[PDB]
Amino acid sequence: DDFVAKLQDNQRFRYNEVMQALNMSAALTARKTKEFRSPPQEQINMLLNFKDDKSECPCPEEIRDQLLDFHEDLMTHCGIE
């Protein structure tokens, strides 16, 4: 619940930034808005790429760390480590 609330608010803020900044470059605006034009499943799968070190997802460090703490809490509960 709260992870998705924060992610949705961040994507709102990023969309606002794009709507502010599209005027400098029209061509780069398509690359910025590919995320918002993608289907919602693709959007969430894109936002959930901060595992590993590829790190091309448009996710902030704090929202990233929230799940990068919950995941190891879950592994500890499951007995993985």
């Binding site: 619940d1 998705v4 969309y15 959007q43 969430i44 936002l47 595992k51 995941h71």
Partner: protein, 67 residues
């Protein structure tokens, strides 16, 4: 073009729909990809005959759990 621009950003979606989408995406991206190696240890523990001489079998040697 209007549908692509202003329809289906997940910040406009209701909370529960986005939560379900996150559950599915989290599953596929993280839980499936999570890899831990245990097979060698599991098979060694299963193959170990557990305290057979201490245990009073007074007969043929009992088959190990792997067997």
């Amino acid at each position: 073009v209007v549908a692509c621009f202003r329809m289906a950003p997940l910040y406009n979606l209701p909370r529960h729909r986005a939560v379900n989408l996150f559950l599915q995406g989290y599953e596929k991206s993280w839980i499936e990809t999570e890899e831990h190696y245990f097979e060698d240890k599991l098979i060694e523990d299963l193959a170990k005959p557990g305290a057979e001489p201490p245990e009073e079998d007074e007969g043929t040697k009992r088959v190990d759990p792997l067997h």
